[PDB]
Amino acid sequence: YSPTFNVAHILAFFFLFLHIPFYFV
Amino acid sequence: YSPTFNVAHILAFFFLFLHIPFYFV
Amino acid sequence: NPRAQVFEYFKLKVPATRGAVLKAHINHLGNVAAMVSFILVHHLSWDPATQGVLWAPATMFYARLYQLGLDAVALSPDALFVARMHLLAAIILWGFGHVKSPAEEKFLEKVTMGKALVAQFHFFALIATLWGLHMAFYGILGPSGKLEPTGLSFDMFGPITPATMAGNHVAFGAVFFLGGIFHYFAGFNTKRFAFFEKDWEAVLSVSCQILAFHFATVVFAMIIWQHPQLGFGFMREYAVSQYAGPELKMIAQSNPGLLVKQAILGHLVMGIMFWIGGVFHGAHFMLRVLNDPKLAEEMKDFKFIKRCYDHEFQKKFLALIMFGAFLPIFVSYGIATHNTIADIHAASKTGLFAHMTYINIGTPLHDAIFGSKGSISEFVAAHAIAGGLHFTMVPMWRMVFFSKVSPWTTKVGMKAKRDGEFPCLGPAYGGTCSISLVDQFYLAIFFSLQVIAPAWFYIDGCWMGSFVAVAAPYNDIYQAALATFNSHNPLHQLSPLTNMGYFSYIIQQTTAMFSRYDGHMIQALLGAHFIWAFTFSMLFQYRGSRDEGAMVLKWAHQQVGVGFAGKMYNRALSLKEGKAIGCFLFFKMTIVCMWALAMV
Amino acid sequence: NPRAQVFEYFKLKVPATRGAVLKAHINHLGNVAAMVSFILVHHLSWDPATQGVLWAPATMFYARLYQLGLDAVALSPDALFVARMHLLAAIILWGFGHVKSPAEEKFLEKVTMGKALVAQFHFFALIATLWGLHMAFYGILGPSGKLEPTGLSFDMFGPITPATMAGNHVAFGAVFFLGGIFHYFAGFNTKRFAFFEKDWEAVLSVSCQILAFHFATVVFAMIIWQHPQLGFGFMREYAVSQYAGPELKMIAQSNPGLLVKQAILGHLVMGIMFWIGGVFHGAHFMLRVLNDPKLAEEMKDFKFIKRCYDHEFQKKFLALIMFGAFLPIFVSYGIATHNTIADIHAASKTGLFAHMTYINIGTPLHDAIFGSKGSISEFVAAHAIAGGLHFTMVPMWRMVFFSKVSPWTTKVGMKAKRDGEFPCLGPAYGGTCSISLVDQFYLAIFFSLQVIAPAWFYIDGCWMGSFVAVAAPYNDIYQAALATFNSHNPLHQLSPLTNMGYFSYIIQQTTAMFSRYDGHMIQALLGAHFIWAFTFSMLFQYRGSRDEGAMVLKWAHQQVGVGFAGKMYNRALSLKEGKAIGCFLFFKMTIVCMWALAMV
Ligand code: AOH
Ligand code: AOH
Ligand code: GBF
Ligand code: GBF
Ligand code: GBF
Ligand code: GBF
Ligand SMILES: CC(C)=C/C=C/C(C)=C/C=C/C(C)=C/C=C/C=C(C)/C=C/C=C(\C)CCC=C(C)C
Ligand code: SF4
């Protein structure tokens, strides 16, 4: 739960959710 | 500002605003 | 031939054969076991050794471990053994679920839905009997905080004991055993029931609708049956037991029903969802009947073929539903608005709103029948919920009876609505959006918030006589209501009756959210509000605007060499897609916000 | 021939002749005088002898009486004399405004808009000179609390005194006198200006747009020019003067800029409205140019005829606007979201959100140029407002350049959008709602809330570094910002800088609303929220649903013999009507809620 761990995992959620609209568009 | 004055004037606002949609419908 | 019987988008995605359906059911069992294994291990807290189990859904599942008489410490050897065995089960089920089994398929060609139902009766009989026997000989959590075998008793009318609750399960085993045998021999061929063997969507619809009614009985039972080991009181006890982490315990001490009300909100919401989705399937089945000129010679006996074409029946019936919504909404929201104006302005000495009387009505019919002693809070809340139910039913009964022809399609000269999924017919006649069957499904989902929200505010102890907190001149009415709430309303086990109408309660709960769970429910609120707002961009009459603007965004991404990102704007979501996704997210983001309220 | 140049609904309602337009202008002057007379007498408070003037708009107009050196007691002899003379003026103006004047009309046939503008220059010259002379010899409120003649001085670069402010008015009289004479002789015939004489809508558009820019300069001047008699500080002084009622005084002591910020919010909102409505008129004028094959041989010299057909110009230009919105929004809302997450979770000791750094950036460019010393609050707020402006401009530039053809109409095979008012073209191509000129007007109104809301939150002293209140670990950043705000930001005259982001500020302000004005602003909030919610029923893709359901409601009213009420459901509002009314009410009910915030 260091800054690098936390930014990394935040970016993981970001990249993941970002693919949801591609499935429809 | 008795109960009868106040109910009367409330009903006046009601009847008045109620005519706004008639102008379009 | 399911691929022919679903909306276009799903023809390539629906399980298309007997075998594929069974595999989907197997994989769904894998999902069930897998969720259990995941949630006993992950999403407990940031540091379970010191914080315990703090986070939702995990808290409810650990409360179950507690009720089973197991060590309900976070990540205990019992919890891990349970979680790992359910994972094993999930992998075995998904394994079988993703391989083809031709012999299994060949046999399925011989199975009817009546036969499957016989088999389900005796599988349920097995489960009920074995669980009664587990209780009887190995036990559950007992009154002494130890695992205690319950014994077995069949004194149905004596006091409830662990032994008679075990007997209740064994008796259900016997009943479903005899009922399965009876139907094994007699079938379900009686008239008005033979048609079910014809159509999987009719069976599916009925399962959803009855499940919704079960959900409602469970909501009420979770409030009323609060026994600490044999009822849903195990969720109160767990939250203050030796296994509870320090913060869960601190929250439960000011909010004893915390976890019970989370379970209640889950079952209220899911029940509404199965009610409306079940009715959508039944209506869709009827619409396929009406669109299959063949499918008429066997169903002509049913009155709905006529009613779906009879404009006088449609108006009389829907008008009756609208009255059933109008009158209780008018009474509940009108009273609560007058009382709100009175509470707001109570300090005024002159002017239009000074010295208003509080409207104070009890609930004599409910009291005479069920033994409550309700106040204006129950009177208003129950009429608002009843009204919300009839309100929600307006789009529901239009799904059922307006989805082929209606007085409107006749008025404008149409022969019939083409199908169940079209989004609109354009600007003719001043605009035609959302007359189809699926668009009334969405609208019922939207309207169902008039059931869920007042029900939640009531269950969490809001004053429902008013939208704001009771003012000092009316304190006597609050205090009398509090006395009979405490002495006669079983809800007082889960919630104190506050003097706060929902608006004031929102201020107080949201303030409390800053200081539980390190503030996280504020993050939840803010993120949910953002997404909710964004759904407007999909639900408003603005799709063409977006499709036109999307071309500029795509073009701009391509200009700079990142066309893989510009593909996000290859086109705007269509009318149909944006309405489905917008409704789903509008509805669920509202539920997320209410979930925040359930967490504090 | 205005009746041919407006949307269909207005052809029968627009003043159709020179004479009728003049009469409308006269009657509008009657409205102005009448509002002044009404608001000095009515809507002061429930009991002015004891409560003073407490209610909005009346407070601002009584603050003017105060600044004029008159007795600004509620219903004073001065106030009544002013109110009764303005009523007299209103009746005389409406009198003349509702009678036909054929000689006046005959003369108007000879008047050009260039001539009218000459006349306006010298009417404004008269007003400016006479007001300077009134100040000079009869006076306004002086520093001693008495009416004091200002004298007259033309020392423009000396210190500001009452006498030089009088000189400023007289000088404006002279300047507009010379400018009116100059243009009387030279005209406005220069190229790029001669076309204005052709079209009243072009003149009208420019008047609105420039007025919008004046509004913005007034917003800034009301914050910056706070002199107590010669600037907008008279609204601070009035609220704590001997004339102020007790409650207004109590509010102003904790909120000195109370009335100033009400005036600011009014001018911000009206300015946005004239900017967007002015651009709509200019765009509508251009669209009529593009639709009149005749109207081309005189305008071919202007580049917009080409740009309105050039798809590469359209994409490049609109993409530049979208970038101008995207980048500052990304920076402002992204920073403020990170900081929000940090403030929310500041108490956490472990987990993903613990021990975040606060993003802290100043405003060195603004400071170097204007002498501020800003903090992260100004940096975020200014980029959010700048971004909101470019965001709002996206629908605005589409009104201007996309309303005849666009890359989208070419993509789908259309020749051209038929007109400026059509609501949609139906479900083809996945849906086509709101590509017309007027539908982009509405969208700009909607988007303009991204300018108004952050601007208001900033002006009222919200912490704009975060959406919630600053947490204790970041208090040093707040305190440093507070020091340089107090010493370098003129806004500190009107608002203390709180440590509350807008969400926390909403909790605190709404809590305060329960105890001012006998709670009335809670009633305002609740009623406005209800109406706002209802606009969804008009703005969502659901018009056909409503038209179909409306037939049941009308039928039910007729059945019971009250068809005069059922006429309310003769039909649903059309796409076009519901979008216009829905946008108007969505927008204004949001403003009502913000007005509540301006009242406490
Ligand atoms: C809630 C937040 C919200 C956002 C963040 C948008 N709309 Mg949306 N919108 C809304 C509502 C409530 C409504 C109701 C119905 O009125 C609408 C309607 C509508 C219509 C009709 C159209 C267009 O036709 C146009 C378009 O071309 O769509 C393809 C468009 C656009 C694009 C403008 C282009 C530009 O400025 O890009 C620039 C993009 C931005 C300025 C957004 C950048 C955002 C961030 C960096 C994230 C911020 C994140 C957090 C704070 C957590 C752009 C992506 C965008 C963002 N909207 C439209 N709209 C809400 C929001
Ligand atoms: C905010 C409050 C709100 C109300 C009070 C309604 N909708 Mg509306 N609505 C909403 C949203 C947010 C949306 C978004 C888009 O989803 C929609 C959409 C939509 C569509 C698509 C249709 C229909 O097609 C149908 C119809 O036939 O319209 C002619 C209809 C109806 C009628 C149902 C008939 C019946 O139950 O009458 C019974 C009428 C009622 C139960 C309302 C009685 C109300 C009061 C007595 C006043 C309460 C006053 C206070 C508390 C201050 C009924 C008058 C009605 C009330 N709506 C529809 N809607 C909000 C509200
Ligand atoms: C037992 C419950 C159940 C079942 C079996 C179905 C089945 C269906 C079938 C008949 C179709 C097409 C679905 C599709 O192809 O799946 C595709 C999905 C899969 C094949 C899933 C496969 C899984 C994976 C690849 C892996 C995922 C793993 C995880 C997520 C862990 C469908 C359908 C709808 N359904 Mg329902 N529904 C429900 C409950 C509901 C609930 C009650 C609701 C709403 C609250 C609805 C609202 C709708 C609605 C609106 C529609 C549609 O339009 C559509 C239709 O055409 O009906 C006419 N339906 N529904
Ligand atoms: C925003 C979406 C959303 C929201 C707010 C809820 C809320 C809830 C609450 C009301 C309860 C109790 C808390 C819990 O167990 O949550 C569990 C939440 C999830 C499994 C998924 C939540 C979704 C996300 C975190 C991702 C959201 C992403 C976006 C919004 C883009 C509940 C629940 C369940 N729900 Mg859902 N669910 C969903 C999506 C789903 C998705 C669509 C699925 C399956 C694919 C489910 C399957 C279940 C399931 C099984 C249960 C329960 O046991 C429980 C209940 O009380 O039933 C009576 N649920 N669900
Ligand atoms: C000086 C300011 C001004 C003027 C003269 C006009 C004039 C017009 C005319 C050209 C048409 C038709 C109006 C109608 O017939 O009136 C009818 C009203 C009367 C005749 C009023 C008579 C008064 C009474 C009977 C008594 C009322 C007394 C009281 C209320 C006290 C019109 C119009 C529009 N306007 Mg504007 N607008 C504005 C400012 C604005 C503001 C800036 C806004 C938005 C914020 C707009 C947005 C629009 C918009 C969208 C449209 C339209 O679609 C429409 C159009 O067709 O343009 C192309 N417009 N606008
Ligand atoms: C819901 C509607 C609404 C709202 C919230 C506002 C809000 C405001 C605020 C932002 C300011 C300052 C307070 C005040 O003087 O209000 C005055 C409010 C009204 C005159 C009318 C308010 C409407 C109702 C009470 C009825 C609402 C009915 C329904 C929502 C169904 C302001 C204002 C003005 N506004 Mg409006 N206005 C309107 C409608 C109108 C109507 C459409 C009209 C004319 C027909 C005006 C003409 C003016 C005008 C002249 C002024 C100002 O001097 C002042 C300002 O600051 O300008 C810079 N305004 N207007
Ligand atoms: C019901 C229950 C028990 C739980 C419900 C839970 C729910 C719904 C959970 C929903 C979770 C969601 C959606 C999580 C979304 C995460 C998105 C991220 C990390 C985006 C990062 C973007 C970045 C860094 C770019 C910069 C950021 C900006 C410019 C703002
Ligand atoms: S949904 Fe859009 S395209 Fe369809 S009728 Fe409504 S406004 Fe027109």
Angle between helices D437-447 and D449-459 (to 10 degrees): 20
Which single residue is written with the structure tokens 């989370």?
C262
**The three-state (H, E, C) secondary structure of B1-25, written as one string:** CCHHHHHHHHHHHHHHHHCCHHHCC
Contact C375, C465 (CB under 8 A): yes
Q: Does any ligand 1 atom lie closer than 6 A to the CB of residue D486?
A: no
Give rounded-to-5 percent helix, strand, coil for chain C.
Answer: 70, 0, 30
Between CA D511 and CA D459 the distance in angstroms is 20
Ligand 6 atom nearest to D265, measured from its CA: 10
Nearest to C260 by CA among C211, C225, C285: C225
The rounded Å distance from CA D204 to ligand 4 centre is 55
With contacts defined as CB-CB under 8 Å, which chain B residues touch C350?
A: 1
- Torsion of the alpha carbons at C384, C389, C392 and C397, rounded to the nearest 10: -140
Experimental approach taken:
X-ray
Number of other CB atoms surrounding residue D231 within 10 Å: 18
Amino acid at the residue C499: N
Q: Is C509 assigned to a binding site?
A: yes
Q: Is C593 labeled as ligand-binding?
A: no
A25: three-class secondary structure by DSSP: coil
User: Using CA atoms, how far apart are residues D510 and D597, in angstroms rounded to an integer?
Assistant: 8
Question: What does each C-alpha distance from C142 to C79, C134, C230 come to in angstroms?
Answer: 19, 14, 9
Task: Tell me the sheet residues that pair with C141.
Answer: C147
Report d(CA C343, CA C358) in Å as an integer. Answer: 8
How far is Cα of residue C7 from the mean position of the Cα atoms in its chain?
24
Q: For residues D340 and D333, what is the distance between their CA atoms, to the nearest angstrom?
A: 10
Please report, as a single letter, which amino acid is at residue D346: A
- Closest ligand 8 atom, CA of C543? 2
**Spatial separation of the C-alpha atoms in residues D306 and D317, rounded to whole Å:** 14
Q: Please name the residues in contact with D115: beta carbons below 8 A apart, sequence gap of 6 or more.
A: none
Per the CB < 8 A criterion, the answer to whether D255 and D239 are in contact is no
First to last CA, chain A: 35
Tokens describing residue C323: 């009255």
Q: Is C255 left (phi over 0), alpha (psi -120 to 50) or beta?
A: beta
**C109-144: buried (b, 16+ CB within 10 Å) or exposed (e) per residue?**
eeeeebeeebeebbebbeebbebbebbbeebbbeee
Structure tokens at D223: 């914050």
DSSP bridge partners of D140: D148
| Paired tokens of A9 | 């995992």
Structure tokens at D514: 């329960």
- Distance, in Å, from the CA atom of D463 to the CA atom of D482, rounded to the nearest integer, reads 10
Residues contacting residue C420 through CB under 8 Å, at least 6 positions apart: C7, C284, C287, C403, C436, C437, C438
DSSP states of D71-131: --STT-HHHHHHHHHHHHHHHHHHHHHTS--HHHHHHHTT--HHHHHHHHHHHHHHHHHHH
Tokens representing residue C545 in the block: 């605007």
* Interface probe, candidates B4, B5, B6, chain C, greatest C C-beta count within 10 A: B6
Count other Cβ atoms within 10 Å, centred on residue D356: 20
Helix (H, G, I), strand (E, B) or coil at D229: coil
- Which long-range contacts (C-beta less than 8 Å, at least 24 apart) are formed by D576-581? D576/C430, D576/D9, D576/D421, D576/D423, D577/B24, D578/C431, D578/D538, D578/D539, D578/D543, D579/C541, D579/D423, D579/D434, D579/D439, D579/D442, D579/D538, D579/D539, D580/D438, D580/D442, D581/B24, D581/D535, D581/D538
**Closest Cα of chain C to D459: distance in Å?**
22
CB within 8 Å of chain C, chain B residues 1-25: 1, 3, 6, 9-10
Write down how long chain C is: 600
C330 reaches B (C-beta below 8 A): no
Partners of D354 on chain C (C-beta within 8 Å) are 518
Chain D, nearest residue to B23 by Cα: D568
Torsion over CA of C438, C442, C445 and C447, rounded to 10 degrees?
A: -110
Q: Which residue of D has its CA nearest to C349?
A: D518
- Identify the nearest ligand to the CA of D328 by its number: 1
Which residue in D46, D569, D573 is closest to B24 by CB distance? D573
Distant-in-sequence, close-in-space partners of C357: CB < 8 Å, separation ≥ 6: C342
C-alpha C89/C-alpha C93 separation (Å) is 6
Are 3 or more Cβ–Cβ pairs between B and A shorter than 8 Å? no
* Collapsed DSSP state (helix, strand, coil) of residue D313: helix
> Is D282:D400 a contact under the CB 8 Å cutoff?
yes
Separation of C21 CA from ligand 4 center, angstroms? 24
Beta bridge partners of D141: D147
What contacts 24+ positions apart, CB below 8 Å, involve A10-15?
Answer: A10/D352
Least Cα distance to C535 among C595, C597, C594, C577 occurs for: C577
Containing H/E element for D148?
A: strand D147-148
SS3 track for D29-63: HHHHHHHHHHHCCCCCCCCHHHHCCCCCCHHHHHH
Q: What is the DSSP letter of D436?
A: S
Cβ-based neighbour number of residue C76 at 10 Å: 16
C-alpha distance from residue D16 to each of C63, C375, D1, D104, D417 (Å): 76, 62, 7, 16, 27
Size of interface B-C (CB pairs under 8 A): 9
CA atoms within 13 A on the CB side of D529: 9
CA proximity to C140, closest of C77, C70, C217, C92? C70
User: To which residue do tokens 């009922």 refer?
Assistant: C179
Cα of first residue to Cα of last residue in chain C, in angstroms, is: 49
The tokens describing C268, both together, are 């209220």
Residue C313 sits at the chain D interface (C-beta within 8 Å) = no
Q: Which residues are C140's β-sheet partners?
A: C148
> Hey, what are C258's tokens?
């915390």
Q: Do residues C405 and C308 touch, judged by C-beta distance below 8 A?
A: yes
Residue type present at position C148: E
Q: How many residues does chain B have?
A: 25
> φ and ψ at C197, to 5 degrees?
-60, -20
Which subunits have 3 or more CB–CB pairs within 8 Å of chain A?
A: C, D
SS3 label, residue D540: strand
Q: Which residues of D528-566 are buried (b: 16+ CB within 10 A; e: fewer)?
A: beeebeebbbbbbbbbbbbbbbbbbbbbbbeeeeeeeeb
Which amino acid would we find at residue D420?
A: G
Is C148 strand, coil or helix? strand
Q: Which tokens is D291 given?
A: 């639709």
E-only strand ranges, C33-180: 140-141, 147-148
Question: CA-to-CA distance for D262 and D251, rounded, in angstroms?
Answer: 13
Ligand 3 pocket, C10 CB below 6 A? yes
C249-286: buried (b, 16+ CB within 10 Å) or exposed (e) per residue?
eebbeebbbbbbbbbbbbbbbebbbbbbbbbbbbbbbb
Would you call D307 exposed, middle or buried from its count of C-beta atoms within 10 A (0-12, 13-18, 19+)?
Answer: middle
D58 Cα–ligand 6 center, Å: 13
> Can you read off the two tokens belonging to residue D161?
């005194």
Residues D392-414 as b or e (16 or more Cβ within 10 Å = b): bbbbbbbbbbbbbbbbbbeeeee
Question: Which residues are near ligand 2 (CB < 6 Å)?
Answer: C 322, 325-326, 329-330, 333, 337, 391, 394, 443, 446; D 530, 533-534, 536-537, 540, 542, 545-546, 549-550, 572
Best residue among D3, D5, D10, D579 to mutate for probing ligand 5, ranked by most atoms within 8 Å of CB: D10
Give, in order, the Cα–Cα distances in Å from D474 to each of C321, D379, D471, D488.
57, 17, 6, 22
Whether C contacts B, i.e. 3 or more CB pairs less than 8 A apart, is: yes
Interface contact D355, partner C, CB < 8 A: no
**Element containing residue D141 per DSSP (H, E):** strand D140-141
- Measured between CA atoms, the residue of chain B closest to residue C353 is B6
Q: How far is CA C49 from CA C52, C245, C251, in A?
A: 6, 9, 19
d(CA D212, CA D141) in angstroms, rounded, equals 30
Q: Does D413 touch chain A (CB under 8 A)?
A: no
Q: How far is the CA of C527 from the centre of ligand 7 (A)?
A: 7
Cβ neighbour number for residue C315 with a 10 Å cutoff: 19
Token pair for residue D288?
């009529």
Residues of chain A neighbouring C568 (CB-CB closer than 8 A): 21-22, 25
Name C451's Cβ contacts closer than 8 Å, sequence gap at least 6.
C272, C385, C388, C389, C392
